[PDB]
């Protein structure tokens, strides 16, 4: 992945930071996948995440190809979701939808699923051929019993309006997050360790 | 804390970064108390950490009092340590000390204990009254199998010098930490969520 053209199919700054801190240089081409699938049409939440990440990356690969006629070597997609008692929580639409989210996470242990898709692209016969490997990572996260005192002061953050489930763990999330169990970078947005473990089995 | 002067008794920036990111402002006054507490004088490693945090905070309370004789209202002391199968790891001495720490932490699971002391002071009647509350938080942390010359590179960066166990949480872009179990702000240096839980207990 030194010589290979790598692009990242997300505009999330926290994913960029994780990958760039790891030494990987990549282009950032956010995906135009405005569509989002049906959650009930999947067996498991991480299945819905791995597919949403697949479509994000394939939208980027088929847009770069049919516009530059360049097939990027690798396209990376990712989708981070949250589940509470089975119900799937994506990212909020307005500030008080964060409340409806945050009020449900409160006092409870939930899962963070991030499905990743590594799309290897090659061009032949004016067609973009795609070989896509998918995987996911789960991290359990416990929220302390949250009063609405810290709830509104935490929606007034402006912080949760982009995150999955309406929360982060580093800035102001410290009062929210009692404990996490599993890959912690997966909570922040990208399961970096599992991602580097994957690549070596596709190559070797 | 709405009307009182707060003092933090440590020079580590990530402790300061955490608490100010929590919306609490204060003043940084490091402690002149060496961590020469005899470890055999304790039964548990967290008892040692709490006692060390107490003395650090108490020294700052005294020095700020034997100077101005206007006792700051609450002074916070913290001590973070790492344990690997009973062995206590603290801040490294040289680079060889920082190197051996991580390569023993290699691929193994260890415990991170941070002990916190909240010292309440009162000086109205020409003398210092100090009432302290101590507590700790433990997080288990597993490291991945990473080669020696690569974490010998992490030692050359200067990052291991100020950290318990000789590592921060974004070490090697985040590939040194495979998993965490517990509060992760406890790992970087300060158990904010537990500290907030305590602060409301001291009062109401």
SS3 B172: helix
Cβ <8 Å between A144 and B182 = no
| Structural tokens at position B132 | 């302290």
By C-alpha distance, which of B45, B41, B118, B34 is closest to B80? B45
Q: What's the gap in Å between the CA of B172 and the closest CA on chain A?
A: 7
Residues 6 or more apart from B17 whose CB is under 8 A from it?
Answer: none
Q: What angle do CA B193, B134, B159 make, to 5 degrees?
A: 60
Asked if A14 contacts A188 with a C-beta cutoff of 8 angstroms, the reply is: yes
Q: For residues A111 and A64, what is the distance between their CA atoms, to the nearest angstrom?
A: 34
From chain A, the residues in CB contact with B172 under 8 A are 22
In chain A, domain spans = 1-204
* Strand residue runs (E) in chain A: 6-8, 27-28, 74-84, 87-89, 109-124, 127-143, 177-182
Asked if A191 contacts A114 with a C-beta cutoff of 8 angstroms, the reply is: yes
Residues 6 or more apart from B157 whose CB is under 8 A from it?
Answer: none
Asked if A116 contacts A191 with a C-beta cutoff of 8 angstroms, the reply is: yes
Resolution in angstroms, to 1 decimal, for this deposition? Answer: 2.6
Quick count: other Cβ atoms within 10 Å of Cβ A163?
22
B159 conformational bin, left if phi > 0, alpha if psi -120 to 50, beta if neither: alpha
SS3 A56: helix
| Structural tokens at position B69 | 């004789």
| Torsion sign over Cα A87, A150, B49, B104 | positive
Return phi, psi of residue A50, to 5°. -70, -30
Quick count: other Cβ atoms within 10 Å of Cβ B150?
11
Q: What is the β-pairing status of strands B74-84 and B87-89?
A: antiparallel
| Structural tokens at position A90 | 């994506």
From chain A, the residues in CB contact with B177 under 8 A are 184-185, 193
Task: Report how far apart the first and last C-alpha atoms of chain B are (Å, whole number).
Answer: 13
- Where does chain B have alpha helices with state H? 13-21, 45-68, 95-104, 148-156, 185-188, 192-201
| Structural tokens at position A156 | 């007034």
A31 conformational bin, left if phi > 0, alpha if psi -120 to 50, beta if neither: beta
Task: Tally the residues of chain B.
Answer: 204
Q: For residues A188 and A18, what is the distance between their CA atoms, to the nearest angstrom?
A: 9
Q: For residues B183 and B82, what is the distance between their CA atoms, to the nearest angstrom?
A: 14
Q: Is B79 a catalytic residue?
A: yes
Who among A18, A23, A180 is closest to B180 (CB)? A180
User: Which residues of A fall below an 8 Å CB-CB distance to B?
Assistant: 18, 21-23, 144, 169-172, 174-185, 192-193, 196
SS3 B188: helix
Asked if B51 contacts B42 with a C-beta cutoff of 8 angstroms, the reply is: yes
DSSP state for residue B166 in the 8-state scheme: G
Q: For residues B79 and B199, what is the distance between their CA atoms, to the nearest angstrom?
A: 18
């Amino acid at each position: 992945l030194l010589h290979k053209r790598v692009v990242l199919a997300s505009a999330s700054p926290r994913r960029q930071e994780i990958l760039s801190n790891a030494g990987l240089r990549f282009e950032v081409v956010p995906s135009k996948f405005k569509e989002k699938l049906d959650k009930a049409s999947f067996a498991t939440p991480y299945g819905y995440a791995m597919e949403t990440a697949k479509q994000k990356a394939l939208e980027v690969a088929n847009r770069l190809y049919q516009k530059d006629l360049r097939a990027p070597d690798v396209v990376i997609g990712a989708d981070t979701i949250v589940t509470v008692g089975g119900l799937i929580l994506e990212k909020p639409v307005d500030k008080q939808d964060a409340y409806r989210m945050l009020s449900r996470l409160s006092g409870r242990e939930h899962s963070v699923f991030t499905g990743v898709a590594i799309v290897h692209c090659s061009s032949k016969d004016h067609q973009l051929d795609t070989r896509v490997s998918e995987f996911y990572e789960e991290t359990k996260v416990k929220f302390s019993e949250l009063s609405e005192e810290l709830l509104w002061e935490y929606v007034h953050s402006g912080e949760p309006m982009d995150k999955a489930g309406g929360y982060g763990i580093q800035a102001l999330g410290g009062m929210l997050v009692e404990s996490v169990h599993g890959d912690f970078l997966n909570v922040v947005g990208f399961p970096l360790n599992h991602f580097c473990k994957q690549l070596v089995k596709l190559y070797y």
